[PDB]
Amino acid sequence: RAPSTSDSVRLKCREMLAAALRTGDDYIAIGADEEELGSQIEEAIYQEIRNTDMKYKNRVRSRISNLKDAKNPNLRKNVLCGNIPPDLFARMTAEEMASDELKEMRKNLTKEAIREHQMAKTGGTQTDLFTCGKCKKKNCTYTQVQTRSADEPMTTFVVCNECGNRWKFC
Amino acid sequence: MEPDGTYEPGFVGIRFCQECNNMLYPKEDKENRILLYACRNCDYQQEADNSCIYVNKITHEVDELTQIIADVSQDPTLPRTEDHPCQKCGHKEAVFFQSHSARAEDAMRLYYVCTAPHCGHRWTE
Amino acid sequence: TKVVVENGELIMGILCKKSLGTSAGSLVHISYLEMGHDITRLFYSNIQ
Amino acid sequence: RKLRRQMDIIVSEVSMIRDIREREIRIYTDAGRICRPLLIVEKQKLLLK
Amino acid sequence: DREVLRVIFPTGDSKVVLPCNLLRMIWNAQKIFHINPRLPSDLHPIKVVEGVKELSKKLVIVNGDDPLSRQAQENATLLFNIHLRSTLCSRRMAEEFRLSGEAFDWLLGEIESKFNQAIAHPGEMVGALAAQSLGEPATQMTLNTFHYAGVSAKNVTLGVPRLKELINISKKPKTPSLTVFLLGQSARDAERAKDILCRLEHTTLRKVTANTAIYYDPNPQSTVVAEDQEWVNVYYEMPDFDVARISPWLLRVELDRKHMTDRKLTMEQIAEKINAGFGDDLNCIFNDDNAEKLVLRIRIMNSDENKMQEEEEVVDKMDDDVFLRCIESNMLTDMTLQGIEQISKVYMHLPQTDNKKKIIITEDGEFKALQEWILETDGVSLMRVLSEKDVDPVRTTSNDIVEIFTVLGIEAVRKALERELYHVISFDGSYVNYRHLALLCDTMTCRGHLMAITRHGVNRQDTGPLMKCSFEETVDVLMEA
Amino acid sequence: GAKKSAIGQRIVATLPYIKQEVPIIIVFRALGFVSDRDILEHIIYDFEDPEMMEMVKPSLDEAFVIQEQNVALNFIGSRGAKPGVTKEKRIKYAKEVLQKEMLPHVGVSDFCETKKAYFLGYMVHRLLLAALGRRELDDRDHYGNKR
Amino acid sequence: NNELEPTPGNTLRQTFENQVNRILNDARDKTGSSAQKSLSEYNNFKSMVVSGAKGSKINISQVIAVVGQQNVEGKRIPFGFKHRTLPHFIKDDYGP
Amino acid sequence: MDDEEETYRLWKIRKTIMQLCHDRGYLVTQDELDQTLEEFKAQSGDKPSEGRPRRTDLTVLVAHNDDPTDQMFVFFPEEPKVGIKTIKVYCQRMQEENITRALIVVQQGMTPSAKQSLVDMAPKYILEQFLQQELLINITEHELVPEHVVMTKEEVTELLARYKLRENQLPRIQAGDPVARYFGIKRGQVVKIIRPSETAGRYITYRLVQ
Amino acid sequence: KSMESVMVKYDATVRNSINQVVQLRYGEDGLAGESVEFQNLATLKPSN
Ligand SMILES: [Zn+2]
Ligand SMILES: [Zn+2]
Ligand SMILES: [Zn+2]
């Protein structure tokens, strides 16, 4: 369904979009016309923006970057065969498109590595020796303090992390 | 245009003025649409050899593999390795170390310099 | 291994400092309360 | 150093230091420097008899 | 009382220092009266009830002629009365304690007698006692090494220097800090917490850039940077009518994709940031993140008309080359892409399994621990941190007492200083009486003003002339007096 | 602000008796080495590293406000004091400081001024390596650095 | 080998220094615990420690077994002798 | 930014101030207390278009302590920095309405004459001034916050009477406190501070405003 | 030098050298700290 528009800039973007879909002949093999698809994408950007905004132009531009990719021709092909409708393809939901082959893998592992950056934080301890009467689990910590002090004897202090319990060797 | 190329343009840090050995400065020839280089104190000026005149934020490379003459190898307090064959000369006695600098290199990885005469090579494994 | 005294009579238990003083649950604090400083001081001098 | 070892150079005064890292040889013969006697090891062995 | 008590102690610790150990007293009656589990436990429960009701009357600390004094009487005695009411239950007496009424009756006389004893002496110079009560623990190991690990950075520098600074009431802590709590899912979702991490964290433009370079470019589309050449050339929807006069000089910056991984950022956010700061006067273009490298190449908006030696004003309004440097000097150093502009970078992660906190009530009425993601940050923008979404404004605190005064006021200050002093005290592990710490906070705050109680604030005080002169200045207070 | 976007690269020597600090490069003009190549050799015999070249570049921008040795001496003298308009005296005084008050330990002789210049560049170079980070920061606790 | 994995939120060196520290602590504690076992109740020292007087197990470790790691502000002894502590040591030495 | 989230701020600040008014004793409707952001957009028909006069829409009367003096008013100026010009028109509006109390919430800065005129206003009338960013978070939601109750003059009279307390003896409280600003407390007035006690179980104190 | 300005009063209220009130009563109870002791309330018992 070719959506005609009256604005010359929109048509010009549509022509530029039709030109981007010309990449690598895939439109021929699928048999879909680049101009109609290009026209449907721009209209869809417009259906949301309803104005020749720079940011509207920016979406064409983000769309341009996705069209002009050569590492994911199957993306264009998934769009061409209607598996990714132009209104869907335009109509967000892919997070900088790069599906198929590697940037997604990279994207996942990147999500892993940044997720890993909280994991442990920066320390550790724990001894797991003394039982805690508030939770039976020996989830305890121990202190080495009072090197000299006064008349009070040097003690080993044990604290239970969970449920907050602290007691002494004495 | 591919994510497999590199950017080593060979930046030109300076060119001295032939009239005074002072630094030449960039300038445009808006009339000829061309970059030129001129000295300030004198009228000496000459065309540019490249469009690049500036670079910034520096030090994301392997400095420690550079700036290290193999003559360190004469230091007895630097440990030889039983690991053989200089990357050049078919002989052991490679000298090894970390980066050991300001770029202490969280890289605790050994770097090897053969001490055998006729090579001088600095590598790592 | 555990300390217990009844009617001024020690049933069992090796003594410690937490028992002997400068801490909560100490014999010294309760004697001060019941027996008062004067009786506790004479007991203390006596024991030493 | 051999002149230093020959006592033709005053070991008690003359300090001589080389840094390959700096490509430098520094020497100091000023007063107030602290020095101590040491055994001289040669070929991973003592020079004394 | 049990229902009320859950409110009073969110820590769920029932072990508190209180006067008159009734258990030992009750036990002593058993030792005396010779009550045993194989003997009947003859008791009148109403007498118990009345005995507690009467003893409650005996708990006089103020007059009871009017209800407000009684309300003053009731609340001041409230916590003890609950310990008393919880302990002196009818079932406890008969079952656990198996007390006889006579044993109970003698015991009541004893408890009251203990009550009469608990009263402190009026006229007491307890203040000098409290000063010594602070001074003695300060003598100990308040500075003895940063033994603290706690999976984090070593914040709120331990002890005396903070204590000295605190006494000096320095405008800003030597080591400012702030604890970021997380509401709902952020407490359980790292991914949400990281999303907050990205939102909160300070980010300079210099932090973001991989590299910068300045080029002489004959044509914005037929650029000399041939790698970017299709990237510029393909763009055409950009008003390239006013670019026929823009800076022939090209300035190009390279951006750290690692940084983009690092803080989870995008190009569109960057371009929109740059234009908003510099205004329309700066042209901005960039390649996609899927490129070989993130680069951004900029131009000055030479708007065709009067920006062409119109008045010749012999000043040279601005040379290009230098102006690329002034912007770049300004671009790196000035712009903050993300974050609070004084929190350095600011986060450390801790798992709540750290301490006895966020202990929550359950259907059973039993207390349970709640684990969570938390960030401890160096920063004090309390309005801004309170203003942040998803962070809990209730629990979130900062080591700076000054912001508490500024935002929440002196009343909140009284509590935070109280918590912090207790916190220093909790670190040394040596118990100190709480009433004194409560008392100390009242002394500094009694004016309702945050000011050094030291010599650095005496002249503002309404204190007597002999006092102020006693602070070594002597003659200056005395001459004015 | 909008002046030069990069003041942080200006070192600024602290000269004896002078009422304020002045750029090291101004001293080099007082040394008479008007040619940057000559100063660079004085700085390093190996300027082939662009990194060392870029770091010193902002000091080179300072050098052009005064090229003449004579003006440089009067300048340093003007920073020294105000002997009226007699800018022979400021130069002459600068000359005495340059000989005697500056680096006496190498010699106060006139011909040892060029020789004096050779030490300052290594001194800056040593500073430059550490300022660049190539040199490690000297210890104050070390006794070999002590007497 | 640079095959060592750095701890999340820490540098490899911070991990390395931390990792060596756990080992020097676990071993000393283990060898200490052996000494706590190895002593009779007949001993005056165990008698002195148990009674709550001026002693402890760590003392036993120090007197009988091992004093443990010395540190500067909690950090291992810095390389004041040019990437070394002493000329008796080899350069780049990392022994405890 | 300023595209959707802003509505959340305007919603949350509207609830914070309404709860504040509600706390002042004014009979705010529970639904106003209860409304959601989605409902908030719905209640104002918010965002038919951008930069719409929500701050004019947010502007409201609030009214009802149980003591029917009635009529307190809250106005949200459109200008970030408010000038005397808007203050005079506001003064005209409050006068024409003959309101008892006017609350004006300013986004940024103010002219010192307007600041002055706001301070003096009238010996028999009060004008209130609140900064929007400080309203953006309810500080009384914080755990460290004790319960504050304004005391009637008679309660103060009874308080002094029962203790024989001298006015000076009472701890002062500075009117520079945001919370002091929150209650709209006046100088010389007393606020009842209710605190948890780790000793008593409950502790009550009072401070006169200075 | 700071804390010397404060003492307990006969009306239980804590006051300073210019007779101004610090506290309604010392430690909000007026009782002696020595007569205080560590105790378990145990009313925060798990199961209701
Ligand atoms: Zn536990
Ligand atoms: Zn020239
Ligand atoms: Zn070799």
Side-chain angles (χ1 to χ4, degrees):
Chain A
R1 182 181 169 273
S4 55
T5 186
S6 57
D7 179 80
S8 48
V9 196
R10 295 184 67 193
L11 291 168
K12 169 58 161 47
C13 289
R14 290 173 179 209
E15 176 75 12
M16 291 163 55
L17 283 163
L21 280 160
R22 194 175 285 101
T23 305
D25 298 342
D26 295 342
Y27 72 93
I28 315 180
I30 300 297
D33 185 24
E34 65 280 358
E35 182 182 26
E36 207 209 330
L37 293 179
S39 297
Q40 283 164 349
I41 294 168
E42 186 283 330
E43 177 84 7
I45 302 175
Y46 203 97
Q47 179 172 9
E48 243 69 354
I49 308 302
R50 295 187 296 278
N51 185 39
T52 318
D53 183 12
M54 171 78 173
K55 209 164 203 47
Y56 150 93
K57 302 182 183 76
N58 190 4
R59 195 52 53 83
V60 169
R61 291 207 293 240
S62 83
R63 265 331 146 292
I64 286 170
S65 65
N66 290 3
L67 284 170
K68 285 181 64 61
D69 182 51
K71 297 182 183 295
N72 308 273
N74 197 228
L75 183 143
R76 177 166 56 248
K77 291 185 190 188
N78 271 275
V79 176
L80 287 164
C81 69
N83 190 43
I84 305 176
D87 83 47
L88 181 59
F89 176 71
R91 205 100 34 194
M92 268 134 79
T93 78
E95 193 185 350
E96 57 277 357
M97 308 189 72
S99 297
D100 194 359
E101 208 44 19
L102 181 60
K103 227 296 191 81
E104 211 79 67
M105 292 295 281
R106 184 182 304 224
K107 186 191 297 284
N108 191 65
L109 72 87
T110 303
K111 289 156 38 177
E112 301 299 294
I114 58 84
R115 185 204 310 242
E116 219 67 358
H117 195 23
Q118 287 181 284
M119 297 295 171
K121 233 310 77 55
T122 41
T125 50
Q126 176 65 221
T127 179
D128 200 12
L129 259 65
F130 293 92
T131 307
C132 179
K134 290 178 180 185
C135 55
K136 79 185 287 192
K137 301 169 52 181
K138 302 182 290 298
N139 189 342
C140 297
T141 44
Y142 72 97
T143 329
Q144 307 294 353
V145 71
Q146 295 186 333
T147 304
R148 180 173 179 280
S149 305
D151 295 324
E152 185 71 16
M154 51 170 312
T155 307
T156 299
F157 298 71
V158 179
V159 183
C160 178
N161 302 311
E162 54 173 359
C163 86
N165 199 60
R166 58 180 291 146
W167 69 114
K168 303 204 307 186
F169 186 81
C170 187
Chain B
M1 298 180 192
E2 74 272 2
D4 191 53
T6 184
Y7 178 68
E8 48 186 346
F11 185 75
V12 185
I14 198 175
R15 56 178 57 63
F16 295 140
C17 177
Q18 70 171 15
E19 187 272 350
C20 50
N21 294 333
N22 299 129
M23 176 157 62
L24 297 179
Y25 284 138
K27 89 168 129 76
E28 188 168 19
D29 182 320
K30 295 179 174 179
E31 191 277 328
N32 292 311
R33 191 57 178 163
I34 53 175
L35 181 62
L36 301 177
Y37 272 141
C39 195
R40 289 183 180 173
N41 59 50
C42 57
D43 57 342
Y44 176 78
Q45 62 181 36
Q46 66 151 98
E47 69 187 299
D49 49 354
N50 69 335
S51 60
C52 180
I53 64 164
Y54 176 79
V55 69
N56 200 4
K57 182 173 172 186
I58 43 147
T59 312
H60 311 274
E61 58 187 346
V62 188
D63 191 6
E64 75 278 10
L65 188 62
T66 68
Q67 300 298 326
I68 176 65
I69 53 174
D71 280 64
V72 276
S73 70
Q74 299 159 36
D75 182 22
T77 63
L78 294 174
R80 301 288 181 274
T81 184
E82 71 285 355
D83 194 10
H84 29 102
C86 175
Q87 62 174 0
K88 190 201 180 176
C89 62
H91 183 271
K92 51 174 184 82
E93 299 296 324
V95 178
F96 68 94
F97 44 84
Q98 299 168 13
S99 48
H100 294 306
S101 40
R103 203 167 92 122
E105 220 53 38
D106 194 62
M108 188 153 164
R109 181 186 58 182
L110 295 180
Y111 299 151
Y112 302 151
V113 172
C114 193
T115 195
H118 182 205
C119 68
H121 277 85
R122 65 205 192 177
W123 78 114
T124 186
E125 302 292 340
Chain C
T1 60
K2 299 193 173 181
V3 159
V4 48
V5 42
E6 298 207 335
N7 202 31
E9 205 174 346
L10 178 62
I11 320 192
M12 57 203 107
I14 187 169
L15 261 66
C16 76
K17 179 184 174 186
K18 198 164 278 155
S19 11
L20 189 55
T22 334
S23 307
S26 59
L27 180 59
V28 71
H29 191 248
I30 64 171
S31 294
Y32 183 108
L33 297 172
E34 271 38 82
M35 297 294 168
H37 68 88
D38 197 17
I39 299 181
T40 306
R41 73 165 292 278
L42 184 55
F43 168 60
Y44 261 142
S45 294
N46 198 30
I47 190 172
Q48 287 171 316
Chain D
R1 179 115 12 223
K2 288 181 302 185
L3 292 166
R4 193 183 192 299
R5 291 176 176 179
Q6 279 162 356
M7 201 189 180
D8 303 322
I9 283 181
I10 308 303
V11 294
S12 316
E13 188 60 37
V14 180
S15 295
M16 45 166 291
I17 326 89
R18 181 169 168 222
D19 191 55
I20 303 299
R21 176 72 59 183
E22 294 183 337
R23 294 173 62 191
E24 194 173 342
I25 292 167
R26 52 172 74 84
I27 296 177
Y28 294 95
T29 180
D30 62 333
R33 278 184 297 106
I34 319 183
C35 62
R36 71 196 197 94
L38 293 174
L39 282 158
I40 295 169
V41 174
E42 183 63 26
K43 303 182 289 298
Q44 71 264 359
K45 291 180 293 302
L46 183 55
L47 186 59
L48 187 63
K49 185 181 177 174
Chain E
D1 288 0
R2 171 182 172 86
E3 257 348 295
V4 162
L5 189 67
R6 289 158 167 54
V7 190
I8 311 305
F9 300 97
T11 58
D13 180 26
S14 310
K15 296 174 289 295
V16 289
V17 287
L18 286 176
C20 306
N21 194 337
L22 301 179
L23 307 180
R24 299 192 302 95
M25 297 177 73
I26 290 161
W27 191 21
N28 188 37
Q30 293 173 310
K31 190 216 78 88
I32 291 163
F33 281 86
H34 305 303
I35 302 301
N36 62 70
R38 289 174 187 176
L39 190 73
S41 309
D42 185 75
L43 178 63
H44 194 269
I46 298 300
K47 181 58 173 179
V48 179
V49 173
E50 199 67 14
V52 171
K53 181 197 289 172
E54 189 192 352
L55 183 58
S56 79
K57 309 178 183 183
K58 306 293 177 67
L59 307 184
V60 176
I61 69 176
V62 287
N63 188 12
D65 176 83
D66 53 334
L68 189 153
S69 313
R70 290 198 295 285
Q71 293 205 330
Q73 172 62 24
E74 195 172 356
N75 87 328
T77 55
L78 184 61
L79 184 61
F80 183 82
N81 188 317
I82 295 169
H83 190 52
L84 188 70
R85 184 184 295 87
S86 59
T87 309
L88 277 59
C89 162
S90 298
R91 180 168 178 146
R92 304 287 305 287
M93 300 281 82
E95 184 182 357
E96 187 164 1
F97 299 108
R98 300 179 70 86
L99 299 182
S100 63
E102 293 192 349
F104 181 77
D105 197 15
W106 179 87
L107 177 65
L108 288 177
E110 254 294 281
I111 296 166
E112 182 190 2
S113 306
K114 248 66 171 180
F115 189 87
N116 284 267
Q117 289 174 32
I119 303 165
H121 300 295
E124 185 63 34
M125 306 188 198
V126 78
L129 188 59
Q132 286 171 27
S133 296
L134 179 60
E136 185 272 340
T139 72
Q140 297 291 338
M141 297 180 301
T142 51
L143 187 56
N144 193 328
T145 319
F146 298 93
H147 187 71
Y148 173 83
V151 296
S152 293
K154 277 65 175 174
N155 238 351
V156 188
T157 296
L158 179 64
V160 179
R162 176 59 172 168
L163 178 60
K164 283 178 58 166
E165 178 183 87
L166 187 63
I167 290 166
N168 203 23
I169 192 58
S170 302
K171 187 176 175 180
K172 299 299 174 179
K174 184 176 179 171
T175 58
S177 180
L178 187 169
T179 315
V180 181
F181 296 81
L182 301 178
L183 286 175
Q185 193 181 342
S186 302
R188 75 187 53 97
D189 190 61
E191 267 341 292
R192 199 176 156 135
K194 282 186 301 301
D195 191 70
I196 302 169
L197 191 162
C198 170
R199 207 171 66 227
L200 184 60
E201 194 183 359
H202 192 278
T203 297
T204 64
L205 194 147
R206 193 180 291 230
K207 174 63 171 83
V208 187
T209 298
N211 206 334
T212 298
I214 299 165
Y215 304 75
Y216 182 77
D217 182 22
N219 189 324
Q221 288 85 4
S222 302
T223 186
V224 67
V225 188
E227 48 181 357
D228 293 341
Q229 197 169 348
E230 79 169 79
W231 293 107
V232 296
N233 164 39
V234 60
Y235 294 135
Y236 180 81
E237 71 299 325
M238 181 71 190
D240 64 337
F241 178 80
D242 56 13
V243 313
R245 285 201 67 249
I246 67 180
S247 175
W249 294 97
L250 163 67
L251 167 56
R252 190 182 69 133
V253 295
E254 190 167 0
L255 305 182
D256 194 58
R257 278 185 170 136
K258 305 182 302 300
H259 181 76
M260 307 312 173
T261 57
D262 186 54
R263 309 301 141 174
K264 181 66 187 288
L265 302 179
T266 62
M267 301 296 282
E268 75 207 271
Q269 296 181 334
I270 297 168
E272 85 173 321
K273 188 100 186 199
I274 292 167
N275 274 110
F278 290 127
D280 180 75
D281 300 334
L282 185 68
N283 190 340
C284 295
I285 193 163
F286 60 91
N287 58 346
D288 189 21
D289 55 13
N290 197 23
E292 71 280 4
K293 57 184 62 186
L294 294 182
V295 288
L296 200 166
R297 38 156 60 219
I298 67 180
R299 298 294 192 160
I300 63 172
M301 291 301 299
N302 194 24
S303 192
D304 186 30
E305 204 192 345
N306 52 25
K307 268 84 187 178
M308 192 187 55
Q309 64 179 15
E310 184 73 12
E311 325 235 356
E312 163 145 18
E313 187 68 18
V314 193
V315 177
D316 298 333
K317 296 175 181 174
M318 198 57 175
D319 180 54
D320 296 277
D321 182 30
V322 291
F323 190 64
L324 296 179
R325 287 169 196 291
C326 286
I327 288 163
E328 177 274 86
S329 286
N330 172 21
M331 186 169 59
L332 287 165
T333 316
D334 187 23
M335 186 175 289
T336 299
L337 269 65
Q338 183 59 280
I340 307 178
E341 191 69 20
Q342 83 278 348
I343 61 167
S344 296
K345 344 151 333 171
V346 84
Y347 65 97
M348 185 50 67
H349 186 81
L350 265 104
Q352 222 28 64
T353 298
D354 192 28
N355 50 42
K356 178 190 280 294
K357 289 179 188 77
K358 291 185 66 61
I359 306 300
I360 59 178
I361 193 63
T362 207
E363 68 293 347
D364 193 10
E366 66 180 352
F367 292 157
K368 56 186 173 188
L370 187 52
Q371 298 191 333
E372 71 172 343
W373 303 128
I374 69 179
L375 300 183
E376 292 138 350
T377 72
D378 164 272
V380 290
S381 54
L382 175 61
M383 182 185 289
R384 303 174 76 163
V385 172
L386 286 168
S387 304
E388 294 294 332
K389 298 169 73 181
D390 201 13
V391 175
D392 182 29
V394 185
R395 296 187 302 269
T396 294
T397 46
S398 178
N399 71 328
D400 182 66
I401 311 303
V402 182
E403 291 297 327
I404 293 291
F405 191 18
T406 307
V407 178
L408 296 176
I410 195 63
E411 283 299 299
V413 162
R414 193 285 198 162
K415 306 301 295 176
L417 184 63
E418 179 195 1
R419 288 159 68 124
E420 182 74 338
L421 288 170
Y422 172 91
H423 184 38
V424 175
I425 275 322
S426 297
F427 198 99
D428 177 38
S430 303
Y431 170 82
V432 176
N433 195 323
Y434 163 77
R435 75 206 308 97
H436 304 125
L437 301 184
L439 176 60
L440 179 59
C441 295
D442 288 329
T443 308
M444 192 169 181
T445 60
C446 67
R447 294 289 293 172
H449 180 45
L450 179 62
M451 183 185 59
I453 194 167
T454 64
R455 175 273 201 174
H456 305 355
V458 78
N459 196 20
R460 183 168 178 156
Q461 299 177 355
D462 294 328
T463 53
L466 296 180
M467 186 169 184
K468 285 168 175 163
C469 87
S470 298
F471 288 100
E472 300 293 334
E473 285 306 314
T474 64
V475 186
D476 215 38
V477 181
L478 294 169
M479 291 184 306
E480 188 59 45
Chain F
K3 292 174 183 179
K4 313 249 328 162
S5 236
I7 186 169
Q9 291 291 120
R10 303 168 157 258
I11 331 265
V12 295
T14 310
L15 271 63
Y17 302 140
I18 306 302
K19 304 188 184 187
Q20 63 172 26
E21 294 82 355
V22 292
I24 52 177
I25 196 135
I26 309 304
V27 192
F28 277 99
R29 293 281 194 253
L31 288 162
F33 299 100
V34 297
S35 302
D36 310 324
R37 175 170 154 200
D38 303 337
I39 308 174
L40 193 69
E41 190 161 331
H42 273 339
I43 297 167
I44 185 56
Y45 59 85
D46 187 64
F47 58 90
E48 303 290 344
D49 183 64
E51 188 184 6
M52 289 291 293
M53 174 59 226
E54 301 296 324
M55 180 62 180
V56 79
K57 183 180 288 177
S59 71
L60 307 181
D61 201 353
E62 307 193 342
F64 284 166
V65 298
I66 296 179
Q67 293 294 94
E68 177 62 26
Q69 185 177 41
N70 176 295
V71 179
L73 290 167
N74 181 50
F75 181 83
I76 293 167
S78 304
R79 300 307 187 251
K82 194 191 180 186
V85 298
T86 318
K87 63 166 181 291
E88 187 172 293
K89 305 177 177 290
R90 304 191 197 186
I91 291 169
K92 166 68 171 179
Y93 178 64
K95 186 65 165 178
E96 295 282 11
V97 164
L98 182 61
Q99 287 179 9
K100 290 196 189 53
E101 306 296 333
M102 183 183 182
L103 303 175
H105 84 284
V106 303
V108 303
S109 54
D110 207 289
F111 312 143
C112 201
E113 285 172 355
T114 312
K115 179 156 149 178
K116 194 156 292 192
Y118 283 117
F119 187 76
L120 183 60
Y122 169 59
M123 183 174 178
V124 168
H125 176 259
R126 200 167 184 269
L127 176 59
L128 288 174
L129 288 170
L132 181 60
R134 293 186 185 175
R135 186 54 58 192
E136 298 178 348
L137 292 177
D138 299 333
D139 183 48
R140 178 177 301 105
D141 195 22
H142 191 261
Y143 293 84
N145 300 340
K146 291 190 295 182
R147 298 297 180 268
Chain G
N1 297 343
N2 204 22
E3 63 181 350
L4 196 157
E5 180 185 9
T7 292
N10 296 305
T11 69
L12 201 165
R13 297 185 190 300
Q14 288 161 22
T15 306
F16 176 89
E17 64 173 350
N18 178 66
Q19 283 298 111
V20 301
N21 182 56
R22 67 191 285 165
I23 304 165
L24 271 47
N25 178 95
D26 167 72
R28 89 211 169 78
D29 252 289
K30 188 173 291 163
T31 54
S33 309
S34 284
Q36 161 58 19
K37 288 187 184 294
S38 298
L39 265 59
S40 62
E41 301 290 338
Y42 182 78
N43 194 326
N44 292 302
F45 210 74
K46 207 180 198 174
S47 289
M48 192 271 190
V49 168
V50 169
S51 69
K54 298 179 174 183
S56 284
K57 181 192 182 189
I58 185 61
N59 297 111
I60 308 178
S61 302
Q62 296 210 323
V63 303
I64 308 188
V66 49
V67 172
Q69 174 68 54
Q70 293 299 314
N71 47 31
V72 172
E73 300 180 351
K75 301 183 181 300
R76 307 171 77 223
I77 303 299
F79 287 153
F81 187 73
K82 181 65 182 185
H83 303 76
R84 293 180 286 180
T85 51
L86 288 175
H88 294 277
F89 299 102
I90 194 70
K91 278 182 177 176
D92 199 13
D93 185 12
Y94 290 136
Chain H
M1 66 189 74
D2 284 339
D3 50 9
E4 182 269 347
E5 195 277 336
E6 59 159 64
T7 309
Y8 182 100
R9 316 179 303 233
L10 304 179
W11 176 52
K12 171 60 181 175
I13 66 185
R14 180 164 177 97
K15 206 172 288 282
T16 297
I17 62 166
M18 289 303 183
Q19 290 166 297
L20 175 155
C21 286
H22 173 89
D23 215 278
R24 283 185 182 202
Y26 297 138
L27 293 176
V28 170
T29 48
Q30 178 64 264
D31 207 23
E32 206 182 19
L33 291 167
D34 218 347
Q35 102 283 31
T36 62
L37 185 64
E38 291 286 288
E39 286 164 309
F40 173 78
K41 279 173 49 62
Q43 289 166 348
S44 65
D46 184 28
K47 199 175 302 301
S49 58
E50 242 359 281
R52 71 181 291 257
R54 274 187 294 299
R55 297 166 292 202
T56 306
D57 279 343
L58 279 171
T59 293
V60 75
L61 197 74
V62 294
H64 255 11
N65 190 351
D66 190 27
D67 181 19
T69 45
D70 302 332
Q71 195 180 7
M72 184 170 73
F73 187 77
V74 188
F75 173 47
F76 296 167
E78 306 293 329
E79 56 187 347
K81 192 177 189 179
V82 175
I84 195 63
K85 213 164 189 26
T86 282
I87 297 297
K88 290 170 176 174
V89 169
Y90 194 33
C91 283
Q92 289 164 350
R93 290 170 179 180
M94 65 180 68
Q95 289 187 338
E96 183 53 34
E97 200 72 13
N98 193 28
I99 53 178
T100 61
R101 285 194 180 226
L103 197 180
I104 196 171
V105 180
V106 175
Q107 317 189 299
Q108 197 187 347
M110 294 177 299
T111 63
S113 50
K115 287 162 163 181
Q116 180 161 0
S117 306
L118 186 157
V119 164
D120 193 15
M121 187 60 205
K124 299 295 177 184
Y125 175 84
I126 296 173
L127 208 175
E128 298 186 54
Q129 193 49 114
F130 283 159
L131 181 64
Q132 280 179 25
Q133 299 80 358
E134 104 194 314
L135 293 176
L136 187 61
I137 182 61
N138 190 347
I139 58 172
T140 55
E141 296 174 353
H142 198 286
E143 65 187 351
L144 288 176
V145 175
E147 194 157 2
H148 300 271
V149 182
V150 293
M151 294 185 65
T152 64
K153 178 188 174 188
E154 301 289 330
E155 278 174 3
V156 173
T157 290
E158 210 191 336
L159 177 73
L160 268 67
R162 186 176 287 103
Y163 290 106
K164 303 293 179 297
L165 182 137
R166 293 301 176 269
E167 182 181 0
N168 196 290
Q169 298 175 8
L170 191 64
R172 262 347 176 253
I173 181 168
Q174 283 177 349
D177 185 24
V179 181
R181 291 183 60 244
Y182 192 85
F183 281 96
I185 197 69
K186 304 293 298 187
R187 186 168 289 101
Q189 305 188 309
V190 186
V191 188
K192 178 172 60 186
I193 326 297
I194 309 175
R195 303 171 170 176
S197 175
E198 186 190 1
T199 60
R202 188 179 208 168
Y203 176 68
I204 296 300
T205 190
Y206 328 102
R207 308 189 74 131
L208 182 146
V209 179
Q210 181 169 25
Chain I
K1 291 298 274 189
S2 300
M3 294 303 297
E4 63 179 351
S5 62
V6 302
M7 60 169 296
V8 190
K9 300 295 182 180
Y10 285 83
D11 66 344
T13 73
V14 182
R15 291 171 183 252
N16 68 7
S17 307
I18 60 175
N19 207 36
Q20 293 181 332
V21 179
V22 187
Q23 301 188 322
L24 278 70
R25 62 183 64 79
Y26 168 54
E28 309 181 337
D29 54 10
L31 303 183
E34 309 94 294
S35 306
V36 173
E37 201 183 336
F38 197 48
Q39 300 184 54
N40 184 11
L41 177 46
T43 305
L44 294 181
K45 174 77 192 185
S47 167
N48 272 8

